[PDB]
């Protein structure tokens, strides 16, 4: 019968704390606080939030797209996932001074930083084979050979690449950690949109830990979410007020449906979310 | 539920590691207890978080920061000030066990001094003339605070993968982010690895002071220092000393005074700073790993 304190309670309490204690400014207008941390257990559960329906197909296709090393919004949009599309549009690139760049070209965003770190970005169709540091593979290789290493870090915040990117990274850095055959990951997110992005961000890095745990032969342990600037847009306060009234249902489980040897070999069909019973969708105006 | 404040957050982390920390070995052989992921918020508002449950080497904190600020990677330059904490990490015998034999005694690699004033430059040696090369992240932080304080990208890096091959001891501190609201400056430090007994009380005072410095140059008031840890470990040989420390009751934090209006970060001198109403318990000797 009795269940552990649901992990969603940490998110909802970060909401209620920003609503109660945050200070107001602009950017549509925000309530904001600086410095938060929550710990989401990954052991026999998957922290896909239940107090609204989170866009799981979005989370999954987006990560498969990072791992592929794509920086082309259209490669994701073609999977039915539109979330990067406004950032690669003609006007949006133009208004950043990227007028010679083709539609969709996001510059050196996550997929590039993860697979080609430090290489010279040209364009999104370019071939980067064996340029840059493949941080993701190095991470996997170190977990498999020295799991006690205290420098297992993948870096997305690259100061040289900021002026080339269609969006500055929300996510600065990941650190991985292994104890007793369990893999944890802590994400430093320098800026979080709490209503609209964070529930998605939480599912993303939890899924990346599951995938890494899978290919390194380990068990998923915790996902530690650390925020810098944590903000709620004002147009989200009322919907969040309603979200807070709802009771979390038990987290679902994530099944991986076959043995996968390499990280580039995961496909969308290898994943099954099971027993996901969310409260109804909440639309937050982006 | 009311969170622990002040020094008590530090004693509680120690206590959680002693109890819940699992046994591991590190790259020095010494044995550690470790946990992963921790966070504390140290107010800087009309107090300064120099630990009182043991005496912290304040002149060491101050002098080390002044050394980072001037761009230095040479342990010898801090040593000559009477502060020996980086000595061991630049010794022939420590350097030798990292294929770093062409590097002169005391050349620490592209550590914090290089990273803050010359980021993304090409390191060589500790004597080399780096004027005009790399990004001066520290000056950038300051100027951004004066011009666009609401900016949520005020981040200073010490962790550069491209430079990892060139380093003896790779940064314990990966990044700082800075944050301004209602004319208050906060700083959050992401510490990928924290030696809880020896270094972390030094790290706390250190980044506190940096925040106080950048506040003063910008005419802002100090907000909070948020300390976030990745791997947080206690050396086995630190347990007995820490057990002694944990039975002592904390006394109020002291106050930090800046004794004159300084213009630029580089112009701060040791004598500009006064610590007032520091009443710590006795020193507790702990062995450096
Ligand atoms: N083991 C270890 N090595 C490290 C660090 C660390 O925290 N731990 N550091 C992390 O950045 C750097 C140096 N930091 C240090 C800070 C303080 C002391 C120390 O022994 N403090 C004494 C001061 C006594 C005195 O000299 O008067 C003490 O407080 O007991 C050592 C290293 C580089 N290497
Ligand atoms: Cl090409
Ligand atoms: Cl002035």
Numbering used by the authors:
A (entry chain A): 23 to 49, 53 to 311
B (entry chain B): 24 to 312
Original authors' sentences:
Thymidylate synthase (TS, EC 2.1.1.45) is a ubiquitous enzyme that catalyses the reductive methylation of 2’-deoxyuridine-5’-monophosphate (dUMP) to 2’-deoxythymidyne-5’-monophosphate (dTMP) using N5,N10-methylenetetrahydrofolate (mTHF) as cofactor. In human cells, TS provides the only synthetic source of dTMP necessary for DNA biosynthesis. hTS is an obligate homodimer with residues from both subunits that contribute to create the substrate binding site. Former structural analysis on hTS has revealed that the enzyme homodimers can switch between the active and the inactive conformation, primarily differing in the orientation of the catalytic loop (residues 181–197).
The replacement of Arg175 with a cysteine results in the complete loss of enzyme activity, proving that Arg175 is fundamental to anchor the substrate inside the catalytic cavity. The structure of the HT-hTS R175C was solved to 2.25 Å resolution, showing the constitutive dimeric quaternary structure of the enzyme. Within each enzyme homodimer, both subunits adopt the active conformation, showing the catalytic Cys195 exposed inside the active site cavity. In all subunits, Cys195 results oxidized to S-oxy-cysteine (CSX195). Indeed, an extra-electron density, whose shape is highly compatible with a folate-like molecule, is observed in only one catalytic cavity of each dimer. The refinement demonstrated that the ligand is a tetrahydrofolate (THF) derivative since the pyrazine ring of the folate pteridine moiety was in a bent conformation peculiar of the cofactor reduced form. 5-FTHF is stabilized into the cofactor binding site of HT-hTS R175C by a tight network of H-bonds and van der Waals interactions in analogous pose to that assumed in EfTS. Nonetheless, HT-hTS R175C displays the active conformation despite the high-salt condition (precipitant solution including 25 % saturated ammonium sulfate, corresponding to a concentration of ~ 1 M) applied to crystallize the protein. Even though the variant is able to accommodate a sulfate anion in this site, its catalytic inefficiency indicates that dUMP binding is impaired, strongly suggesting that Arg175 is pivotal to anchor the substrate.
